[PDB]
Amino acid sequence: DIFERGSKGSSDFFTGNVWVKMLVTDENGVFNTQVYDVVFEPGARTHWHSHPGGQILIVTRGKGFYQERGKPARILKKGDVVEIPPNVVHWHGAAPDEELVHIGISTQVHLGPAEWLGSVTEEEYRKATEGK
Amino acid sequence: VDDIFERGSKGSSDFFTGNVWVKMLVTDENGVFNTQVYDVVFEPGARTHWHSHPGGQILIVTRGKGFYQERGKPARILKKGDVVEIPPNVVHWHGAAPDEELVHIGISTQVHLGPAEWLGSVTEEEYRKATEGK
Numbered sequence: 182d183i184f185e186r187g188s189k190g191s192s193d194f195f196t197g198n199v200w201v202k203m204l205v206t207d208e209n210g211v212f213n214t215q216v217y218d219v220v221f222e223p224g225a226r227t228h229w230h231s232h233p234g235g236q237i238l239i240v241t242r243g244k245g246f247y248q249e250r251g252k253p254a255r256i257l258k259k260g261d262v263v264e265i266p267p268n269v270v271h272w273h274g275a276a277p278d279e280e281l282v283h284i285g286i287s288t289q290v291h292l293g294p295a296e297w298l299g300s301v302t303e304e305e306y307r308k309a310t311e312g313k
Numbered sequence: 314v315d316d317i318f319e320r321g322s323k324g325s326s327d328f329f330t331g332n333v334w335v336k337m338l339v340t341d342e343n344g345v346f347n348t349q350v351y352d353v354v355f356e357p358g359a360r361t362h363w364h365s366h367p368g369g370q371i372l373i374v375t376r377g378k379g380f381y382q383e384r385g386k387p388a389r390i391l392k393k394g395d396v397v398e399i400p401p402n403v404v405h406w407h408g409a410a411p412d413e414e415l416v417h418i419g420i421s422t423q424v425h426l427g428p429a430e431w432l433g434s435v436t437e438e439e440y441r442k443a444t445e446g447k
Contacts, residue, residue: 211400211401212369212371213423216371234346237348237350266345288346288347
């Protein structure tokens with residue numbers, strides 16, 4: 182609705198079909214902040230990862246999940262704002278039944294890039310999402 | 314705190330001309346992010362005063378029609394989907410079109426570099442010249 186779909190996200194960092202559109206790439210480092218828009222098709226999600234800088238998600242459409250490692254998953258819908266603290270290992274993605282669209286803001290980009298870990302397994306995903 | 318309001322808290326005449334509603338999305342009370350995020354509605358004709366942010370600002374337009382102008386430069390027309398990169402210390406205003414509202418997300422970057430510096434109102438002549446017939 183607000184933005185066109187971006188380009189297909191790498192299978193190295195995503196499970197399923199995800200489209201990413203860079204809004205602010207901050208190539209010159211002026212803002213120390215990057216901004217992206219992402220569409221997760223049903224079932225699609227990031228791998229587990231963390232950022233040294235805090236991340237902010239703003240949900241613009243659909244239904245999805247955010248989960249920090251060892252913690253219960255949080256249900257996302259339009260309007261929700263997720264503050265992802267620095268270094269917290271987490272994933273986010275769509276509900277099984279419905280796409281998720283959100284803006285993402287990476288803060289304190291200079292602290293370093295995302296650290297990518299393992300995929301969110303089918304088991305982890307079902308456990309987090311089944312019947313919610 | 315701003316969740317208590319229907320449209321947000323009404324913009325103070327100290328900083329805005331006309332009717333504006335602001336909802337803070339990220340206040341960063343605890344400085345975890347060095348960034349603040351807000352959602353703003355400008356009714357037609359409403360706009361910020363001239364101001365600058367030491368750390369810069371990013372606008373993401375979600376609805377309607379507005380204008381962005383840097384001191385001494387031609388105004389830029391804003392529509393849904395537009396992204397405005399406002400560099401550190403650049404003096405500017407933004408706001409709605411004369412006959413349509415503007416809604417946008419604002420991101421104040423590098424907050425630790427200081428608060429916004431607020432200058433004069435955008436005069437009716439400045440606004441008319443910026444917007445009339447556009």
